[PDB]
């Protein structure tokens, strides 16, 4: 089901570019939301766009805030005493009938959802706030014109077979559906492994959003997807050395990627999914969550 | 286990060819012990075997005609539908568990022994009169090594053979962690023992290797994922264990001919209480890496 709040932050538009007006609601466990946290740090937007961390322990009413479901690092809603993320959506639109997903890019002025599509939120962040940033941060652009077509091409099959692929495998309820998802997933990892052989970045020998969008899946792979989602033909760390190297360089050499990566949130969210893991036990491995360089 | 008799000249169960029969599941590591030793000792035409379905049911282990699965067999002797039918033929008032392995006596129609650690010891000597000289000479629990074998078996049994189950069937975070940490500590200890060695004890194959093997061969294919025994894998975390394991599997056909990874994975991942989706993962690929 596609996200249905698809607005932008544009001069003269509904959502004028401003400092201290827009706010992200996210779960650290969610790769889609983590995309927006990574790009928020890359672009130096921490004092321009606020963030609230919901509890990673998904509930019968959806994402709870940290007062409802305490967890280290999870926060109460600062603004409306919202108890679950759905309260934000119903505040924005009492008749809303979509899903109550994170990430939420929220407008505090008009009290509505600007955009709840991670792929668009991170593109908003490329330019919408540049006037509020120092020159070096303003210049960063993870979706530049010259590389857009190439980025779109690799994004298309990474999204379908890898970003969504792990879920297609993990949430499959038949053997047939599981196999139909996990095989194209690992074929695409085989392909990414070739593309990344001898390279630090997927596109253009520079960091782009294609890297960000892949990273949020791959960083969760050995710690959660291999076991919980049965994506276990091989691991990243032992089966895919070019991807493994690319992953570790992003994580260990760029604080935007490590400081937004909370492996305890990640593992707690996935392994609390009772329909898949009814014992609710969280495995202690793999050790470590990500190997050093 | 409560049938604990032996096969001895002059005893209740005389050593004979064609009289005793094993009922086993390929998925069960305890039962696989008896299959491995059966082949090591060349007993295939002396002690029969029937393979039950790995698809454990509400009535226990079914036979292959009840719950078909490649390689699972019908009961040849009593049209048994489930393993419990053998136990109840032996003792209608039996109140124990209907476990495999079963070492069965076709003559008196009873369970001689349903304890794997004793079945494989019976196999060291009880049938030697029926064997060629080279098979007869094999003894996997020899007097000179017994004390050392017993020492390693004690903690392998407690923390590794049983440990994977203590971890996988724990229902609290606390109990899982209490089981999985000693499991991997004991793997660390075994890794040191096996560095530069082909065998755990005495530079020769013993029952200690067999009893460890049945757990380790199931480790990357099932225990890591299904039982959350995932601090590290054998193949990438434990090179000395991995080498020992691969030499046994690839160089001694008793260990490969009796290793059915499809049965192994089907049994574990059909356990609804742990894996309600019932999906069987396609990995790891391969089940065991080559030498
Ligand atoms: N297409 C959205 C997907 C966001 C999404 O699916 N988030 C999940 C968490 S990983 C969520 O909030 N699920 C709650 C639900 O679907 O009810 C995006 O990329 O931002
Ligand atoms: N102590 C016995 C254990 C045998 C055992 O537990 N077998 C399991 C399969 S791995 C079984 O048959 N479980 C059926 C049950 O408990 O009902 C031995 O080592 O032979």
């Amino acid at each position: 089901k596609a996200s249905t709040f698809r607005r932008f932050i544009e001069k003269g538009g509904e959502f004028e570019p401003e400092k201290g007006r827009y706010h992200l609601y996210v779960a650290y466990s969610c790769p889609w939301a983590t995309r927006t946290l990574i790009v928020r740090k890359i672009k130096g937007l921490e004092e321009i766009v606020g963030v609230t961390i919901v509890s990673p322990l998904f509930s019968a009413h959806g994402w709870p805030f940290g007062d409802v479901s305490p967890f280290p690092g999870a926060e109460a809603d600062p603004f409306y005493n919202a108890q679950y993320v759905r309260d934000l959506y119903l505040r924005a639109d009492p008749k809303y009938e979509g899903r109550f997903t994170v990430p939420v890019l929220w407008d505090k002025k008009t009290e509505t959802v600007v955009n709840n599509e991670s792929s668009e939120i991170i593109r908003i962040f490329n330019t919408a706030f540049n006037e509020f940033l120092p020159a070096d941060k303003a210049a960063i652009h993870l979706y530049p014109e010259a590389l857009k077509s190439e980025i779109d091409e690799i994004n298309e099959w990474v999204y379908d077979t890898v970003n969504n692929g792990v879920y297609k495998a993990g949430f499959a309820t038949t053997q047939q559906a599981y196999e139909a998802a996990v095989i194209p997933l690992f074929e695409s990892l085989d392909r990414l492994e070739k593309i990344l052989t001898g390279k630090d970045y997927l596109v253009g020998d520079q960091l782009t959003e294609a890297d960000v969008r892949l990273f949020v899946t791959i960083i969760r792979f050995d710690p959660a997807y291999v076991g919980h989602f049965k994506c276990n033909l091989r691991t990243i760390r032992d089966g895919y050395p070019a991807i493994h190297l690319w992953l570790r360089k992003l994580y260990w050499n760029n604080s935007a990627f490590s400081e937004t990566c909370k492996f305890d949130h990640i593992k707690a969210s996935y392994y609390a999914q009772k329909n898949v893991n009814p014992t609710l036990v969280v495995p202690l491995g793999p050790i470590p969550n990500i190997l050093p360089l």
Side-chain angles (χ1 to χ4, degrees), chain A:
Chain A
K1 295 178 178 181
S3 292
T4 60
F5 284 100
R6 311 293 287 268
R7 295 88 75 85
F8 301 88
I9 296 181
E10 291 182 327
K11 305 277 202 187
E14 185 177 11
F15 300 113
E16 180 77 22
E18 293 185 42
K19 179 180 184 311
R21 179 168 170 178
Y22 302 100
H23 195 88
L24 276 172
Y25 289 95
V26 301
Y28 275 130
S29 53
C30 171
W32 315 104
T34 298
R35 297 167 168 196
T36 73
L37 294 181
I38 294 166
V39 175
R40 173 169 175 272
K41 291 209 67 83
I42 286 172
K43 287 287 291 175
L45 292 165
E46 294 96 328
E47 304 306 322
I48 293 162
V49 177
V51 176
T52 296
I53 307 298
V54 305
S55 173
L57 306 178
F58 199 75
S59 78
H61 306 113
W63 295 108
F65 282 91
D67 50 336
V68 175
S69 172
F71 191 95
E75 297 164 339
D77 171 34
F79 303 132
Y80 317 112
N81 193 49
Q83 295 299 283
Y84 303 89
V85 162
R86 65 192 309 278
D87 296 331
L88 300 174
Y89 279 91
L90 300 169
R91 188 171 192 95
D93 182 354
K95 296 178 173 179
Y96 180 74
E97 272 177 326
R99 301 198 67 79
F100 305 118
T101 53
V102 293
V104 175
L105 179 65
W106 180 262
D107 171 27
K108 300 193 306 185
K109 183 174 189 182
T110 66
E111 300 193 21
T112 189
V113 181
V114 179
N115 194 297
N116 70 333
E117 173 45 42
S118 69
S119 64
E120 290 176 352
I121 296 170
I122 64 176
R123 287 173 187 172
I124 292 171
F125 288 173
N126 283 324
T127 61
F129 299 102
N130 279 352
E131 72 189 88
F132 306 114
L133 296 173
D136 66 328
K137 293 292 149 62
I140 296 175
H141 197 311
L142 305 185
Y143 193 53
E145 254 304 309
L147 301 176
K148 166 165 181 241
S149 295
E150 181 174 2
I151 292 167
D152 285 341
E153 269 141 27
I154 190 162
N155 275 357
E156 201 189 348
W157 58 266
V158 172
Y159 171 79
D160 179 36
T161 68
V162 178
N163 301 147
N164 273 336
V166 293
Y167 293 102
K168 291 194 255 187
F171 290 152
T173 61
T174 64
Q175 189 67 33
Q176 298 61 34
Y178 159 75
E179 295 190 17
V182 82
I183 293 169
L185 165 66
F186 276 91
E187 291 175 342
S188 284
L189 296 174
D190 296 340
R191 185 173 177 197
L192 290 162
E193 172 73 9
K194 291 175 182 80
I195 288 164
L196 285 173
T197 292
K199 301 206 173 171
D200 292 340
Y201 302 106
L202 288 165
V203 175
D205 298 318
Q206 63 188 59
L207 180 73
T208 72
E209 63 153 55
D211 301 290
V212 171
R213 291 168 49 142
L214 184 56
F215 173 92
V216 294
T217 302
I218 303 306
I219 197 66
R220 292 167 169 68
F221 203 93
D222 292 354
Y225 293 148
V226 166
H228 186 65
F229 280 179
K230 294 185 177 73
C231 298
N232 77 340
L233 279 62
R234 58 198 66 83
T235 64
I236 305 299
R237 63 188 62 196
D238 306 307
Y240 290 112
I243 301 177
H244 191 215
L245 182 62
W246 162 92
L247 181 80
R248 285 180 292 163
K249 285 176 180 167
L250 287 176
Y251 177 93
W252 293 108
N253 295 338
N254 192 325
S255 58
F257 287 80
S258 57
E259 293 184 359
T260 60
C261 183
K262 306 308 186 179
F263 289 111
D264 59 323
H265 284 246
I266 287 163
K267 298 180 70 184
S269 234
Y270 288 111
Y271 284 97
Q273 299 174 341
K274 64 177 183 183
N275 56 314
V276 174
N277 186 40
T279 72
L280 303 176
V281 170
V282 183
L284 273 175
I287 295 169
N289 280 307
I290 181 171
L291 283 165
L293 300 166

